Ligand binder design. Structure first.
Ligand SMILES: Nc1nc2c(ncn2[C@@H]2O[C@H](COP(=O)(O)OP(=O)(O)OP(=O)(O)O)[C@@H](O)[C@H]2O)c(=O)[nH]1
Length: 306
C-alpha cells in the first residue's frame, strides 16, 4: 500500500543530478536514468537505466540537437511507459539546453501524464556563458515541457552561482543540491511522514495541473527553530522575486527528528499563512528524519505562480 514515487534523470545533466540524489539519499523513492548515451548508462550508480534510441550517433555533434533526444524518446515510448506504469508520482530532472534532456524530458513527462500520474519537473537553464544557442534550446524545451507536466520548477544556473577552486563539477553541484532539495522536500512528505502526515490528495491538490512553481528552504536550531526555518525559506534567494500570496498553492515540508512538536507545526503554519493568500490552497506536512538532532528544516514550494 506504500506510495510508488519514481525520480527520472534525463540526459547527462539530469543523470548527474539524480546520481547526487542517490548519493545523498531520498527516502522511499525509485531512481531511473534515461539517456541516449549508452556509456553514461553503463557508468551510472542509478539502479535502473533506460536506453532511448539506438545509442549509435549518426553524425558528429548531432546529439546536441533536441530533435535527436525527442526522436530517441519517441522510438522507445513503450519502454518509458512500462517503467512509469503504476507510479503515484513521477519527478523529472533535466539540465535543459543539450540534446537529450531538452528533447526527451517532455516525452517522458507526457508518457507519465497520459498514464494519469502526478508529474513534477525540476529542471535547470544553462549558464549564460554556455552561449545563446543552448539558452534558446533550453527555453524552447521548457515551453514544450510545460505542456506535459503538472508543476514545473525552473532553476536558472545564473541565479544560483564563479571563481578559483570552483570546478565545473562544483558549479553544477549547486544546481544538484537545489534539484535534490525540491524532489526530497515534496516526496518525503509521502514516504517518511512525521507526526502530522500530509494526505497525498492534498499534495495532488496543490501540484496537479498547477503550472509554474518555485522552492525555497531554510534550516535552524535553537528555541525558535520553527519560525526561523520558515522565515529563512520564505526569504531564500529563489523566492525573493515571488510573493507567496500570488501562488494558487503552497506545499510545506517541515523535516526534523523525533522531537518535532505540535506547537512547532502550528508555528510554521502560522508563518506560512501570514505570507500566503486566503484565495489559495495551503498544505503543511512533516517528515521524520531520525538522524536530525536539534535542527529543523522548512521547505516551501509555491505552486500555480504566474
Ligand atoms: N546538474 C548538472 N547539469 C549539467 C551537467 N552537465 C551539464 N549540465 C547542464 O545541463 C545542460 C545539458 O547538458 P547535458 O545534459 O550534458 O546535455 P544532454 O541533455 O545529455 O544532451 P546531449 O549531451 O547534447 O546529448 C548543460 O547545458 C548544462 O547547463 C552536470 O553534470 N550536472
Amino acid at each position: 500500500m506504500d506510495a510508488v514515487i519514481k525520480v527520472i534523470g534525463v540526459g547527462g545533466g539530469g543523470g548527474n543530478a539524480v546520481e547526487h540524489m542517490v548519493r545523498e539519499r531520498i527516502e522511499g523513492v525509485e531512481f531511473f536514468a534515461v539517456n541516449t548515451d549508452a556509456q553514461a548508462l553503463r557508468k551510472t550508480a542509478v539502479g535502473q537505466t533506460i536506453q532511448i534510441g539506438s545509442g549509435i550517433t549518426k553524425g558528429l555533434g548531432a546529439g546536441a540537437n533536441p530533435e535527436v533526444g525527442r526522436n530517441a524518446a519517441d522510438e522507445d515510448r513503450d519502454a518509458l511507459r512500462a517503467a512509469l506504469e503504476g507510479a503515484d508520482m513521477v519527478f523529472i530532472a533535466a539540465g535543459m539546453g543539450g540534446g537529450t534532456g531538452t528533447g526527451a524530458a517532455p516525452v517522458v513527462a507526457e508518457v507519465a501524464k497520459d498514464l494519469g500520474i502526478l508529474t513534477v519537473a525540476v529542471v535547470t537553464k544553462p549558464f549564460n556563458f554556455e552561449g545563446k544557442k543552448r539558452m534558446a534550446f533550453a527555453e524552447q524545451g521548457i515551453t514544450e515541457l510545460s505542456k506535459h507536466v503538472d508543476s514545473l520548477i525552473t532553476i536558472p544556473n545564473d541565479k544560483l552561482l564563479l571563481g578559483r577552486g570552483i570546478s565545473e563539477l562544483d558549479a553544477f553541484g549547486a544546481a544538484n543540491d537545489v534539484l535534490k532539495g525540491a524532489v526530497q522536500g515534496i516526496a518525503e512528505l509521502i514516504t517518511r511522514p512525521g507526526l502530522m502526515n500530509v494526505d497525498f490528495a492534498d499534495v495532488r491538490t496543490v501540484m496537479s495541473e498547477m503550472g509554474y512553481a518555485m522552492m525555497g528552504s531554510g534550516v535552524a536550531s535553537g528555541e525558535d527553530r520553527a519560525e526561523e526555518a520558515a522565515e529563512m525559506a520564505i526569504s531564500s534567494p529563489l523566492l525573493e522575486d515571488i510573493d507567496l500570496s500570488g501562488a494558487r498553492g503552497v506545499l510545506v515540508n517541515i523535516t526534523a527528528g523525533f522531537d518535532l512538536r505540535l506547537d512547532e507545526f502550528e508555528t510554521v503554519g502560522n508563518t506560512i499563512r501570514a505570507f500566503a493568500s486566503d484565495n489559495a490552497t495551503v498544505v503543511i506536512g512533516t517528515s521524520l528524519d531520525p538522524d536530525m538532532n536539534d535542527e529543523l528544516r522548512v521547505t516551501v514550494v509555491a505552486t500555480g505562480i504566474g
